[PDB]
Scaffold this active site. Sequence first.
Site, PDB file in Angstrom:
ATOM      1  N   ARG B  27       0.824  -1.208   0.000  1.00  0.00           N
ATOM      2  CA  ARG B  27       0.000   0.000   0.000  1.00  0.00           C
ATOM      3  C   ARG B  27       0.862   1.263   0.000  1.00  0.00           C
ATOM      4  CB  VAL B 130     -23.722  31.045  -6.082  1.00  0.00           C
ATOM      5  CB  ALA B 131     -28.001  30.156  -3.204  1.00  0.00           C
ATOM      6  N   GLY B 183     -24.927  16.813   1.400  1.00  0.00           N
ATOM      7  CA  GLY B 183     -24.110  17.310   2.496  1.00  0.00           C
ATOM      8  C   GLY B 183     -24.596  16.905   3.881  1.00  0.00           C
ATOM      9  CB  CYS B 186     -26.024  19.842   2.848  1.00  0.00           C
ATOM     10  SG  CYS B 186     -27.042  20.053   1.355  1.00  0.00           S
ATOM     11  CB  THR B 188     -30.629  20.812  -0.668  1.00  0.00           C
ATOM     12  OG1 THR B 188     -29.385  21.431  -0.326  1.00  0.00           O
ATOM     13  CG2 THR B 188     -31.266  21.529  -1.847  1.00  0.00           C
ATOM     14  NE  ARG B 189     -30.651  14.417  -0.243  1.00  0.00           N
ATOM     15  CZ  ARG B 189     -29.828  13.374  -0.272  1.00  0.00           C
ATOM     16  NH1 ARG B 189     -29.900  12.502  -1.274  1.00  0.00           N
ATOM     17  NH2 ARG B 189     -28.929  13.211   0.696  1.00  0.00           N
ATOM     18  CB  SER B 270     -26.673  28.880   4.048  1.00  0.00           C
ATOM     19  OG  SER B 270     -26.072  29.546   2.955  1.00  0.00           O
TER      20      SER B 270
HETATM   21  N1  LIG Z   1     -27.205  23.709   0.886  1.00  0.00           N
HETATM   22  C1  LIG Z   1     -26.254  23.882   1.798  1.00  0.00           C
HETATM   23  N2  LIG Z   1     -25.069  23.267   1.652  1.00  0.00           N
HETATM   24  C2  LIG Z   1     -24.084  23.420   2.546  1.00  0.00           C
HETATM   25  C3  LIG Z   1     -24.258  24.228   3.668  1.00  0.00           C
HETATM   26  N3  LIG Z   1     -23.125  24.189   4.364  1.00  0.00           N
HETATM   27  C4  LIG Z   1     -22.274  23.398   3.715  1.00  0.00           C
HETATM   28  N4  LIG Z   1     -22.851  22.927   2.611  1.00  0.00           N
HETATM   29  C5  LIG Z   1     -22.245  22.013   1.614  1.00  0.00           C
HETATM   30  O1  LIG Z   1     -21.925  20.762   2.253  1.00  0.00           O
HETATM   31  C6  LIG Z   1     -20.608  20.408   1.802  1.00  0.00           C
HETATM   32  C7  LIG Z   1     -19.928  19.384   2.712  1.00  0.00           C
HETATM   33  O2  LIG Z   1     -20.641  18.145   2.720  1.00  0.00           O
HETATM   34  P1  LIG Z   1     -20.166  16.941   3.678  1.00  0.00           P
HETATM   35  O3  LIG Z   1     -18.739  16.582   3.528  1.00  0.00           O
HETATM   36  O4  LIG Z   1     -20.536  17.394   5.176  1.00  0.00           O
HETATM   37  O5  LIG Z   1     -21.132  15.693   3.362  1.00  0.00           O
HETATM   38  C8  LIG Z   1     -19.888  21.756   1.836  1.00  0.00           C
HETATM   39  O6  LIG Z   1     -18.683  21.677   1.071  1.00  0.00           O
HETATM   40  C9  LIG Z   1     -20.927  22.577   1.073  1.00  0.00           C
HETATM   41  O7  LIG Z   1     -20.831  22.323  -0.331  1.00  0.00           O
HETATM   42  C10 LIG Z   1     -25.470  24.880   3.856  1.00  0.00           C
HETATM   43  O8  LIG Z   1     -25.649  25.599   4.838  1.00  0.00           O
HETATM   44  N5  LIG Z   1     -26.485  24.706   2.906  1.00  0.00           N
END
Ligand SMILES: Nc1nc2c(ncn2[C@@H]2O[C@H](COP(=O)(O)O)[C@@H](O)[C@H]2O)c(=O)[nH]1
Lengths: 327, 337, 317, 338
Positions: B27, B130-131, B183, B186, B188-189, B270
Amino acid sequence: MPHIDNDVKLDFKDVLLRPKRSTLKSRSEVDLTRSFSFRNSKQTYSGVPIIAANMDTVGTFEMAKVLCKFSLFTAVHKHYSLVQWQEFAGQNPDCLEHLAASSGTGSSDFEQLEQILEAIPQVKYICLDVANGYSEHFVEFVKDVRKRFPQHTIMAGNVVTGEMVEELILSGADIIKVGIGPGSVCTTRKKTGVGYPQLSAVMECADAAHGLKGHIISDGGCSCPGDVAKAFGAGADFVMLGGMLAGHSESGGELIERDGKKYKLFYGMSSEMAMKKYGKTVEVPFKGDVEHTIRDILGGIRSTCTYVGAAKLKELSRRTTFIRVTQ
Amino acid sequence: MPHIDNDVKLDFKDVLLRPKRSTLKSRSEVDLTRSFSFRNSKQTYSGVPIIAANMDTVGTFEMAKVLCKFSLFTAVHKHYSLVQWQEFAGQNPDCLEHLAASSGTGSSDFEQLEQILEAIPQVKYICLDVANGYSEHFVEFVKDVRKRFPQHTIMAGNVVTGEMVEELILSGADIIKVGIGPGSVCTTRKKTGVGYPQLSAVMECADAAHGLKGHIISDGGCSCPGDVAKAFGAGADFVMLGGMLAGHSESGGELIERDGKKYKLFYGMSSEMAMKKYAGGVAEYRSEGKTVEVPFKGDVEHTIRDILGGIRSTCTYVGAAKLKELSRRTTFIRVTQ
Amino acid sequence: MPHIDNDVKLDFKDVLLRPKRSTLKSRSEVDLTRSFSFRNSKQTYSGVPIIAANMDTVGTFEMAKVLCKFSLFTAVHKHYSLVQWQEFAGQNPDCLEHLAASSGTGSSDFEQLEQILEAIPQVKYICLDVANGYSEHFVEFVKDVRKRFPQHTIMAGNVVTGEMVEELILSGADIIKVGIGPGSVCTTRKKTGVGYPQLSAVMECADAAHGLKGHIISDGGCSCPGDVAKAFGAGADFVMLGGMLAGHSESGGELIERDGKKYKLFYGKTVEVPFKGDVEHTIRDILGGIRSTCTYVGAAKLKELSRRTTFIRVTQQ
Amino acid sequence: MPHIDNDVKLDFKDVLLRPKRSTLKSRSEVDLTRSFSFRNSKQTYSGVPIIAANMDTVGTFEMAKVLCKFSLFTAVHKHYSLVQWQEFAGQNPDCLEHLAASSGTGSSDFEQLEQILEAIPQVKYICLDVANGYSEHFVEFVKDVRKRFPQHTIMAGNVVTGEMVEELILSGADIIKVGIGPGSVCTTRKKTGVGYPQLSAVMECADAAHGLKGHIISDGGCSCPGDVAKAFGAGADFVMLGGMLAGHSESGGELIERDGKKYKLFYGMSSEMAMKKYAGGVAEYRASEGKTVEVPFKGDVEHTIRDILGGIRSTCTYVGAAKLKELSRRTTFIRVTQ
Ligand SMILES: Nc1nc2c(ncn2[C@@H]2O[C@H](COP(=O)(O)O)[C@@H](O)[C@H]2O)c(=O)[nH]1
Ligand SMILES: Nc1nc2c(ncn2[C@@H]2O[C@H](COP(=O)(O)O)[C@@H](O)[C@H]2O)c(=O)[nH]1
Ligand SMILES: Nc1nc2c(ncn2[C@@H]2O[C@H](COP(=O)(O)O)[C@@H](O)[C@H]2O)c(=O)[nH]1
């Protein structure tokens, strides 16, 4: 028969909304209001098409007062006495539109319905809820109500199939309440094995209703804003919330709070507690003020539109492409 | 429409990597570093392509210092004052490559971004978040940043579809941040019903970007090293870790201990605490992140060794002597559940 | 490519065994023993083909003594000193067949392996376990061990694909150990994202091996007797148990009791297997279940089990 | 060999019943009774076709007395002494139809079975339960019982495939008990890896049996009224309840009470508490050695029955079946994701 339907019906869970190219400014540039011209009552609507379910614990005047501040509709539960209505109507003149009087097929109910519609004229919507919306008895009860109030917008349910959707629209109803089984306090599936996944129902029914220039209401099935968004994108004209609204201050039930982890009473409309007082009786954790929950929902819907490119809720479904998720 | 997409999109969970005959020693004979020549900034990169997410609790200088010891990239969160940068840059001269300055579309953000890029000319990377990465307003903003810093490598996201991937690459971005929904913090869903499975997104987007000689970053979705491996094998050039890095010493968040168990906060860009703790201008930065709790993990130090370690095995198992070969040699098997 | 494999690989969980018409008396009329004639060592085997895994906590002499009372095989972990072997071999003359000496590719390991095989000629089996059984470094090592002990039956693993199964059989191995990921204390999937569902692996590999007149061992993946049955029906010649045998008296690990119940450490991941007591009962429970499986399928002999196996796909269960 | 069956077998969970337009008044206009004319015993049946399982904790006379008030069938567990039968038969003259005497293949069992059928001729049903209903042996035992009691309706199980269903019907059985694995106290799958999803089994078997003008019983698998409904709609003529009936007053098991909650032991037919409690000969009674478990005390069966029949009545209303006979005839199963 019995035969098995090849096509698998899917729920909100089995699907997501695919982001799309748009020109939208910010989530604020989104208009969540809609104008509808009902097929039979020939009446008009305008406001955010999300309705608080006509459940004892949800369709309360206390609830209606708040939803009204946001333009949300309310189907008042079929228990308030003619007095409370006049009282409410009194203290809240403006909030009379975007309010519906509910009723079952029962004579008592219908007599309690007339009484209210006659007394308060500012209420131009009727909400008819039968056990089996596929029952001929219902179709006729619907027609009757149509004749007796030819100019009230009629909401009648529930069904889950395009066919019965058309039948009801033609027998006089304006909005068809879609949904059987997926309810929170609803347990049709456990007790009868009868049901139909919300998403597939909404899509199929919404299509049917729209062909006859009618409308539908996605009744039950939503647990989070995303579901409501999914519902709208699926074609629902209105989304009716029950459980998602239960457990608030303005909500019904007894604040029977447990070890810090408070639980408010939430009985279905045909529950064991509803029967004994006038469906499962459950403990929705106290959520505080509906006030926030509404801002949270409208908020989520607003984002959904931004992500998809819909400047107005009306464009939401038109721009919807559902992706199928593994789990 | 609406129309339901026939093809089922799958996540890291729905798949595994099939072992393959190889001639690899141990490895250790695995090189996890990569050389990239960015399409627009025309710049060059070299190091292990794993990035600490630009989240308040993750993209900290304290974090960057450690990841630097291992060659990992860091997208510093959009809060540190020009002073701290100055300080950090000072005490850690070498660790300024493999570091990106983040920013939103907001004017305040962009002005603060310039300030930093002008002051610390070692920071050659920009991270635009961005959002909705599908808004023309973003494509626009990207175009601007491109012009204003024609020689900085630009990371911009997020999207989940090849189309918008191309759009952004042509609009000037170098690396596209892939990911919406999966995320940790995150949601969103839940709040919007909008999303896209990571694996499918990465594969689709990676393909798109690569056609234009560009690159992508698998943003979010990973919970274990295997996922990071899966992401690389799926075609991701960089994998960005958020939650997997939260909860450490070098991490951010409040040590809100509970029941003889030390935890840490996890919100991001956010959330209600982002809005509370920030002067304002984060509402449309990402959904509204969930402020979740993450059990205290101790030193990132280990976690990094654990991740790189897992990736190294994945390569051994598949026959890739270097990360560059991982995806080339990847065959995903579908798991039932 | 990178490409996704269309065909979904399934595990023991995704499947069941369809009952079948038979003429079997009672579950007792079932013979769980098998006769094998190994392809390369040209040796012969006879006994119940279930092996206790060569893990520190499972492949103990203490364990071997009991499994021996039932005809079960044991792959002794590669730690016991030449002394313990000589003692065990001493106090348990008979239980020396159905016992394998384990070893890695490491020189030290191979040395200790020789010493043991030289000292105790009643042991005709070798168990070779490498990290990646797909490495050429392993194929070679296998080839070496073959030459150095042309008449010992060789068990070498692990792999999960017919190809590498053939490669190893031709390289000299007799039994191929099938399995990567599904182990209890095994966590290949979490750390590397590499794995393969047991059932699909066994079926595919069993087929490959059998074409070359060789054999395989279903290594890891079983949590209940039904799984073991499923594995046999899938075509596995031998089923190797690891976790299902951990946590007993004769087992290894430390008896770390907690909040009222007794547990034991299992060693990858280090997990706690609640103390189950005597292996004695677990064995009777396993053989018992396998016996029923055969009765319900119509196999009078373990040899007929797969022959008579029809797997039904289940949504869950 | 071996081969994997392409077609995925589904359970009650994987499916729902599609509502259908109808002309039904209220849930009350539904008749849950059925008339059957058994193929071999040439006998007749009439009543609600739901049977209390012949398990020690469920098929009790105490249970039978209540189910009788509702027209439900009861397969009495094979332990009651000829005396208790006499007594029960005595104090409950009317409730003897809709009652079955159970038995295994064992000589003792058969000997005891005769003794009861001879003494109480008002008991016109036999319930044969073997471990593996696929043994050619069972087939024979069945044929023997047929001859010895040419006029008793015979229930014999269990199997999960049309083939063995026909074999048994032709060998002499009237009703075939369908089900292997899905039982509550049943654990065939864990110990043997052998099983078959109820829904698929019932549909396949119901079909087979019906072709030979025979009948089947959906044995085990139900946890809620909806499942029972699903079973009937799937084609089952009778639905036998075990766990759903355990834990009541009239039920068996030990009335334990812990953590402030009152429970009852619910052991299987071949469980460990069965073999240790029984005189002997129950080890090969059912396909697997059942697990003993604690069912939370449910009070009076009385209510549970009204709750089940109630649910079934709604199912029919929803589908447009005025009579339980029409339920399957009007059934369309929607496959569900979750
Ligand atoms: N929609 C949304 N996405 C977020 C927020 N904070 C972080 N993320 C996204 O979640 C990603 C990380 O995902 P993880 O590694 O925790 O599964 C971050 O890089 C970013 O793209 C948030 O407040 N709202
Ligand atoms: N079948 C049934 N449905 C109910 C009962 N109570 C409420 N519902 C349904 O549940 C719907 C709300 O669903 P929710 O938003 O809680 O998921 C109500 O509009 C109504 O249609 C009940 O007791 N039985
Ligand atoms: N294999 C097996 N099945 C049992 C045992 N005890 C009861 N059963 C089955 O369980 C069925 C009832 O299932 P339930 O209603 O609990 O889901 C009984 O009719 C019987 O067929 C047992 O000990 N072993």
